[PDB]
Structure formats: structure tokens, C-alpha cells
Structure 1
């Protein structure tokens, strides 16, 4: 092709790591960059499946409002940092993975201290979880699932071990979406939308990935305009 069609969007990309991901695409007809960036943004913040802590079990702790000796942090401040942790499985076979951890003595248990698990990777190694002092026992099991959106610990109420405690599920791997529609000058006319959205991600998935998934959800949805009635 050479004219109208060859003048197709030049989807260029610039991505560092698995977090930030810029996306540019132009030219575009009058006010389309908006018509696109917006829905996609809505999707990228709600639809996209992710992963996050859904249940925790501590050695001698029975409820979330307790305190563990030798451990500055309190159970609640810890289950909180866990929500911050970002994991990443590589295939469907992993619906629910339970990462194990057990540390003692003067040590700053970070997320890198979890025993490795085959198909699972941890994007949050140095993440702080607690500061143990002398005689500080800390043996725990933190469940991890693949879901979508926000699920209050009250809503699911996971049941691994009777003494375990449920945590709020934050699935959207996307941290924040953003899109700009700056005019672009191309020979003929000037009124040309130049969409370019910036995506942030916890690490679980990647910008590019997220975007792909997003656009699909849409496409698939557009398909629902098939059988009239």
C-alpha cells in the first residue's frame, strides 16, 4: 500500500523494565486519540488480571490484631506491606501459589527471603517486611492468587489454616494510566490527533502485555454486537 492505508498508524514503542511503558501512535483522525486512550485507560485500570496476596498464616499468631515478639512491626503493618508485594507466574497452571518464609535472629526479612518456587518470580525482592531482633521467630505462609480488580478480605475470606488471616486483594497490575492527545503537523492538514499513553505496572505483567490484553477485552466486547433482538 502507498497512500491512505500506508499512512497507517506508526505504533512506535519505548519501554524500560516491566513497569513503565510509553506508547505512541499517529496520525489519527479528528478527536480519535481521545476516543481510544480513554476506553483503553478504563480497561487497563479495571479489566486486566493480576496477582496479589490473598491470605496469610503466622507461626503463633491467631488474629491480625496481634503482635509478634522480636518483631517491631505489628501483624497488621506486616499484612499491609504484603499487599505491596508483586509476584508473577508464567502460565494458567498457577492459580493459587503459597510462598513460604521462615527467618530468625537479627535480620531484615525482605521479599527475597521467600523460598523459590518454580514458575513463580518476585519483582519485589528488596521489599521490606519486618525487622527481627534477637530471638525473633517468624515462620509464615502467604497465599497468592490470580484475579481481577479489588476484593475486600471480607468478601473472599480464604481458609488455608484455621488461624490464617485474609487480606484485601488488589489485582490490577497496572499502577496508573495516562494518555495525551497532542496535535501533529503532517503536510496536508494540521488537525491530527497524536495519541500516546503511558502505562505503569507493578511488575507482574508488563505495559505492552497489559495494553494487548486491554484492546482484546474491548474487541471481544465489540463482538457482543452480533445477534440482534
Structure 2
């Protein structure tokens, strides 16, 4: 949701000793997958302190309790000799796609709001086959295929979707007339 980089005022700047500009670093961060092991955890801040020369990845974030990085091999930046990257990434929990202009979350003065795509599910397909039982041949076999980023397993996502649909079906219970 938010990123703050030391000695960086806005996202339209370049960091000395860093090959990527702040826009590219934020784009890389948007692909970071963070899994909260605590259901009551709503916000985390991951601290990254790196010194060149190196290829700073997602595994270089400092470990946090009840927080896991599902893609440690994600490339974040390339630090050249003499370059430093001190940054704090605020990761929130939510639903849907919230642009940075809507939430506008800044932990401090120089924090940069980041467009947040909270949906863990990457792709959904469903397939219908002509299964047969007994003497009837018009039956349906349904197969749901779910690709998820790994923070939420596909079974958990399916269970949540079923529960949401059930809760919405309960909305047809009390007629207001």
C-alpha cells in the first residue's frame, strides 16, 4: 500500500547507486506477495536495508512475526557499489483494487502511496463436461481451476467465495413489503 525510501521525496526521482528509478521500484513492489499468518493482522511494515553492490530481492526484507514472503526471489532493485537502499514498505489487508489516489496512505511525510491490488486470486476458469449417471446423459461435470499468488490457497479462496455467495443469498430473506 505505501512505500517510503530514505532521501527520496517523490516517486519521480532516481536514487544514487540504484539502477532502477523509484517508479520501477514501486512497480516491482506491486508484484510482492505477502501472506499474513495472523488473521487479526491488518497492517505490517517491512524494513529493507541494503548496500551495494548487490541484487536486492524480496528475501532481503527483515523478518516479521506472522508475516511471510511468498516470492523471495522477486527482484526489487540492483544496487551499484556506493549505493544504498533504506526503505519501509507498508502492506495492508483489503479487498479489490484501490488506486493510490483513493486511499492516499502515507505513514510519514515522504511516503509514496502505491496502487493496491488486494485480490490474491490470479486467474479463475471453469469447465463443464458431459458426464452421465444412470440412464440420463445431459448431466454437468463442473471443474473450477483457480490460480492464486500463494498468499491464499485456492481452496481457501473457493471457500470464501462460497461463503460470500451464501451470505448474499441470505439477503433475499426479509421482504420489505
TM-score tier after normalising by the smaller chain length: over 0.9
Q: Does 128-137 or 184-193 show the bigger shift?
A: 184-193
Say which structure is richer in strand: 2
CA distance in 2, matches of 1:168, 1:203: 20
- Cα RMSD between the aligned structures? 0.8
Q: Give the structure, 1 or 2, with the largest relative contact order (CA under 8 Å, sep 6 or more).
A: 1
Matched, 1:142 2:89: yes
TM norm structure 2: 0.97
Q: CA deviation at 1:92?
A: 3.1
CA distance in 2, matches of 1:176, 1:170: 14
Q: CA deviation at 1:159?
A: 2.0
After superposition, the C-alpha distances for 1:70-115 in whole angstroms (9 at most, x for unaligned) are 1111100000110100001022331010011000021100000000
After superposition, the C-alpha distances for 1:156-203 in whole angstroms (9 at most, x for unaligned) are 111201011000010110001000111113331111100001001011
How many residues are paired up?
A: 176
CA distance in 1, matches of 2:39, 2:127: 34
Q: Match for residue 171 of structure 1?
A: 118
CA distance in 2, matches of 1:76, 1:136: 17
CA distance in 2, matches of 1:187, 1:222: 32
Unpaired runs of 5+ residues, structure 1, are 1-53
Unpaired runs of 5+ residues, structure 2, are none
CA distance in 1, matches of 2:38, 2:49: 27
Q: CA deviation at 1:218?
A: 0.6
Q: Which runs of 4+ in 1 moved over 6 A?
A: none
CA distance in 1, matches of 2:174, 2:108: 48
CA distance in 1, matches of 2:134, 2:165: 33
TM norm structure 1: 0.75
Task: Give secondary structure in 2 for the equivalent of 1:215.
Answer: helix
CA distance in 1, matches of 2:56, 2:41: 25
